[PDB]
Write a protein that binds this DNA or RNA. Sequence first.
DNA 1: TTT
Lengths: 214, 226
Amino acid sequence: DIQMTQSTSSLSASLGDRVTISCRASQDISNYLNWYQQKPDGTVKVLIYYTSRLRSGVPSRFSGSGSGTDYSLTISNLEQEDIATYFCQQGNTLPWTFGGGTKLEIKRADAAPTVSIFPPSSEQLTSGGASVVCFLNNFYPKDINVKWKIDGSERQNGVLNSWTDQDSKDSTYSMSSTLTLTKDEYERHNSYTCEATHKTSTSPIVKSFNRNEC
Amino acid sequence: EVQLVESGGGLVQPKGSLKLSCAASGFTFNTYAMNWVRQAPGKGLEWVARIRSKSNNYATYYADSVKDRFTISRDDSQSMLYLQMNNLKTEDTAMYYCVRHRGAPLYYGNGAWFAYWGQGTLVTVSAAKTTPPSVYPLAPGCGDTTGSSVTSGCLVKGYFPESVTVTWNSGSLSSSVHTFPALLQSGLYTMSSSVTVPSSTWPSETVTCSVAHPASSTTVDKKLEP
DNA sequence: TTT
């Protein structure tokens, strides 16, 4: 089989930048090398075929070059809508094989998260469980830390954190943090807070509720 | 516009079977080769199989990984593509895309490429049983108020397999929704979804999350309350 | 999917 290698699996670039994504084939593929864009939502489209031919309806900022084993996709003047994973594919011989993909993040100005906290539902409490939820929305850069404080003490056990993909319109991220306890455990403390630490502030962004006021 | 609509994805046990379908429209189905392409979770694309047109006697070809287990076929009268998958394996777990081949090679080159893609159907090969989600509303408790906006949510807990879809007010609210990818905890998935609206329009006006888990035939709605 |  022909192995296709995209040695860069991820990169970050600013609006207006030149982005170059490369692809190496394990043997000569006679310019039968094509490029695809996969949006964060999973939508795939073809950009370039036969090394350099631009697919009808695809913006001219996408161009392809190469020969033999070595090929490149260039995005000139990067735009907001170009957040995606880019894949090369050889169509010279079966099985037709793809590169491993290059995920493109687009930079923006730093932005602090909007924090929201949520007590367990009565529905869940009835079932014998207690999940407290914190949302940190619309922040940049992606790196962020969330701590759970129960009556002032840090709680890490039973915590699950999920980041969104980068937002296609404004390049921000959001994250959800869920702390799950038994209802018995929940009931025996009052103060619940999540604290967000992010490069945008010297002190954390904090949200809190008290159980016996809910 | 070209449309390729996959169906038939779902949970199947190792060594079991599943048939995928794709309903094509917006082009002359019977003149094109058709493919399936797949993508295992968090991984890259892998070509699965091709079937040529009737003019090329419906010649078929398969990736080595699926040969003698999968059968690609088509029904030109109904503009349908099929993938019968037998003796399924864990590593067949993937999103499966129906894909129309490039057209006339005199114009488009001999080399194979994939001109139009469907949105995919998810296939999960696992020993674990279908488990519907518990859905809980996430409402702000009685406390401080940031005048401009309020953020509400829905927690979707302890389901299998993927995936679920959460919509807010029957798809009317789209801008301010965030969907948090599911995470696997102790054999079961959990995800959440948030929506943010002007604080005038709630609670005065109503906000509801609708959670679909097709694998367990469940739809659950939580009307959000102070 | 040229012959």
